[PDB]
Structure formats: C-alpha cells, structure tokens
Design a protein around this ligand. Structure first.
Ligand SMILES: Cc1ccccc1-n1cc(-c2ccn(C)n2)c2[nH]nc(N)c2c1=O
Length: 274
C-alpha cells in the first residue's frame, strides 16, 4: 500500500507556509534509497483530521492530489505544487489578462467538482490556489473544508480562532451559515485578488477597512456595509463584463448568486474575448 509513507525516508527541505490547523513543509521521500526518490508536501496535523478524509475522497486536476499519510497527531502528505500560491506568484511576474481569466476558470472547474461531491471549501483565496508546471491551478488548504449533509444547502460553524472573514458572505459573518453559494462569493473575492495581481495595498482587507473608519466592532460593521450594498472597487484595467461577473457572485442573498456550474461556460466565453 503506497498511501503509507514511512517517517524514516522523509528527509525535509524547507517550510512552505502556515496552512489551517497545520504547518506545511517540502520533503524528499526516497523509500528505495535510489538517490532521488520523490518530492512531496507534508502538512503537520494537530475533529482535527477532517482535511485528510475529505481530500482522500477527491480526484481532480485542479484539486491538490492526496498522496497518503504518516503516523506515530498525524501527517497529511500531498502532491507538490512547485510554484506556490498565486498570492505570492502574481505580485512578482506580469501576467496577461486572458491568463488571469483562464486561472479563474480553472478554480471554477475544481470548485464545481468539489460542490458536486457535496463539500464546501470555506477558505477559497489567492493564498490557497497553487500553480504547477504548465500554469495549471490547484486548490489547496482544505483546513476549513466541510461535508454538507445530504438534504441541506448550508452548514453551521461557530469559529474558534481565525477566519478569512474578508472573503466571506454576510450569511457567514451574520449567522455562521456557509452554503455552497458562499464559496461562490469567496470565488468572487478571489477573482478580485487576481485582477489586483494581489497587490497588498489593494487587497480585500485594506479595502474593506478604509470603507469603515480596526477593532472587534469590525465584523458587525463589515456585515452592515456589505448589507447596505457596498463592494470592492473595480480593479484598474479590469473590464466591465468581468466586474459584473464578480458583482453577481457578490449578491447579498445567496440564492441569487450564480453557481460554479454556470460560471464555467461564462468564463470560457470571456477568456476568449482577449
Ligand atoms: C496552499 C498552502 C496553504 C498554506 C500553507 C502552504 C500551502 N502550500 C504552499 C506551497 C508552496 C509554498 C511555497 N512554494 C514554492 N510552494 C505548496 N506547494 N505544494 C503544495 N501542495 C503547497 C501548499 O499546500
């Protein structure tokens, strides 16, 4: 059985990031001592194992590949995505706009599948969308991902620690209810990030805080500003056609947002424009 990795052949290289509930690091796995073995990403895990059992059930060219784990409180071993998050990639190479859209499209394709499998990612951001060799997109960090019980469209989570609250839809901040349609929202927020090339002095949190005037009175107020109808600016050089698409993902009422199913053909249509 290949999905069992032996702690005795994982020599580490460097840390990679902080994931949700786990630190992540690059490892070289050589169980045959042939002198090269294989390259993998390992997430040191702290119901805290849920990332594992979800990712294990998913097979898709835009979701990060589950390779197996590691035991002695345990450790997720994933396919290695060489180029890291777009959050770091974008602000450091200039990219075409058509290219920015083709990435958006790909995240929809993965997300559509995720949802078709009855999961919510709960964490979709430029941070957590990784690039491989051919510039193919892979959705990562399933730290917050959740099973949606069959029969229902949402799922209630009372947060313990940090939440990407600036990527979340009202229903989530307001009521702690996450629908499939909440991932669509976040996808909208991501799409903005893409088109701001993740410039940090353009990021969602810096923008939303300007709109107000920090503190723990923020989430109440941010709910109130999203609820009054205010949104992120139209990124510079971002076309109307696109900014509308985002705005649609940002419908206040979840039942009004488009689905990932629908987003796919619409994005192919628009990527084709340029
Ligand atoms: C998505 C995420 C969230 C949180 C923490 C780590 C990652 N993360 C980061 C990378 C990475 C960082 C730098 N580089 C060059 N690559 C990576 N590569 N391959 C993977 N599976 C993965 C990965 O999960």
């Amino acid at each position: 059985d290949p999905t069992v990795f032996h702690k005795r052949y994982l020599k580490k290289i460097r840390d990679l990031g902080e994931g949700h509930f786990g630190k992540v690091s690059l490892y070289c796995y050589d169980p045959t001592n042939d002198g090269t073995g294989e390259m993998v990403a390992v997430k040191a895990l702290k119901g805290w194992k849920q990332e594992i059992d979800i990712l294990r059930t998913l097979y898709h060219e835009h979701i990060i590949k589950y390779k197996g784990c590691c035991e002695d409180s345990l450790q997720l071993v994933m396919e290695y995505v060489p180029l890291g998050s777009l959050r770091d990639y974008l602000p450091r190479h200039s990219i075409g706009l058509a290219q920015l859209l083709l990435f958006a499209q790909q995240i929809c394709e993965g997300m559509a599948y995720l949802h078709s499998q009855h999961y919510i990612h709960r964490n979709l951001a430029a941070r957590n969308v990784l690039l491989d060799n051919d510039r193919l997109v892979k959705i990562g960090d399933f730290g917050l991902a959740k099973a949606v019980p069959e029969g229902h469209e949402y799922y209630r989570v009372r947060e313990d620690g940090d939440s990407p609250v600036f990527w979340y839809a009202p229903e989530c901040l307001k009521e702690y209810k996450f629908y499939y349609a909440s991932d669509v929202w976040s996808f909208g927020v991501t799409l903005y990030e893409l088109l701001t090339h993740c410039d940090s002095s353009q990021s969602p949190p810096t923008k939303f805080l300007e709109l107000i005037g920090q503190g723990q009175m923020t989430v109440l107020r941010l709910t109130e500003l999203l609820e009054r109808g205010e949104r992120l600016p139209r990124p510079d050089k971002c076309p109307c056609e696109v900014y509308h698409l985002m705005k649609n993902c940002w419908e206040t009422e979840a039942s009004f947002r488009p689905t990932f199913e629908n987003l796919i053909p619409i994005l192919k249509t628009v990527h084709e424009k340029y």
